Amino acid sequence: DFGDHVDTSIFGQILEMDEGDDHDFSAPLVLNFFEQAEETFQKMETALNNKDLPELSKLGHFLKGSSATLGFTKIRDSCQLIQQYGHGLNVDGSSEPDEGVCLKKIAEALASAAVDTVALHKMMREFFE
Amino acid sequence: MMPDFGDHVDTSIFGQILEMDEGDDHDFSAPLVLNFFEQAEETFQKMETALNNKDLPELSKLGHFLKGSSATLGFTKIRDSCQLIQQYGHGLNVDGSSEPDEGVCLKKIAEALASAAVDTVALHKMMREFF
């Protein structure tokens, strides 16, 4: 019971596809997702010290897609914000004129994304082994 | 008997941690290090929560803590991110300059935290590859 961190329905089907206790299809898939997500952060980091919103918006759109594939709705929702805010848009729905407010909320959301990553990285280690 | 952790680890510090073992067991270090990422992973989950509630003191304490624990291993890249957490968890700039603004601190904390959260993962791998 990953609980909060993994859409119970989505991942089931990723594990169903396996044949046997090899963990033959799912473990390739999630291995790469973590290696992939770790780079998308190094970038998001560089881009926040860049103080982009465009670049950040885009990184956030992406890792939403790739994470929504595995039902990692924790990391998804964070990236959802990275996109929203990166696109100068607030949580209530109003536009966010202030560039700083975005960068702050982004950094805040990126950190909180980078966390559940390390959290799920452990949860997945314990699960697969 | 030679890892090029490079930026991630203080060779000096980790040297003495690995000297305090007995052979291929890594009997002292591998346990202590193994727990670190158990501890670090916990610390972060709190930091996030704390940060989500705009609690500059608690963040500060968390940093102060994890700094020491990390500092002891020679995990410089992760130590220094914490140094910025705790120091800003006071309202203090990188230099020592005053930082009156909360939103300014929170951002640089999240920035630094995020960056800790990465090297953790990065090193976690590097270590597994070492062990």
Numbering used by the authors:
A (entry chain B): 45 to 173
B (entry chain A): 42 to 172
Copy the relevant paper text.
However, to assess the impact on protein stability of the residues involved in salt bridge formation, we produced single mutants E82A, E89A, R158A, R169A, and a double mutant R158A/E82A. A thermal shift assay revealed changes in the thermal denaturation temperature (Tm) only for R158A and R158A/E82A which dropped to 54 °C in comparison with the Tm of 61.5 °C for the WT. Also, SEC analysis for the mutants showed a change in their elution profile in comparison with the WT, with a second peak eluting at a lower volume. However, SEC-MALS analysis with mutant R158A identified a single monomeric species in solution with a MW of 19.9 kDa similar to WT. Thus, the salt bridges involving R158 seemed to play a relevant role in the stability of the helix bundle. We determined the structure of the mutant R158A, albeit at a low resolution of 3.4 Å, observing two molecules in the AU with no differences in the helix bundle with respect to the WT (rmsd ~0.6 Å for 128 residues) but in the crystal packing. The absence of R158 changed the electrostatic nature of the interface and allowed the approach of αE in both molecules to a distance of ~4 Å between Cα of A155–A155.
If the HK incorporates a REC domain (REC-1) is denoted as hybrid histidine kinase (hHK), and the first His-Asp phosphotransfer event occurs in the same polypeptide chain. Then, HPt protein containing a phosphorylatable His shuffles the phosphoryl group from the phosphorylatable Asp in the REC-1 domain to the phosphorylatable Asp in the REC domain of an RR (REC-2) in two more phosphotransfer steps. In fungi, the HPt accepts the phosphoryl group from REC-1 domains of various hHKs upstream of the signaling pathway and forwards it downstream to REC-2 domains present in at least two conserved RRs, Ssk1 and Skn7. Also, we have obtained the crystal structures of Ct_HPt alone and in complex with REChHK6 bound to the phosphomimetic BeF3−, as well as the crystal structures of REChHK3 and RECCa_Sln1.
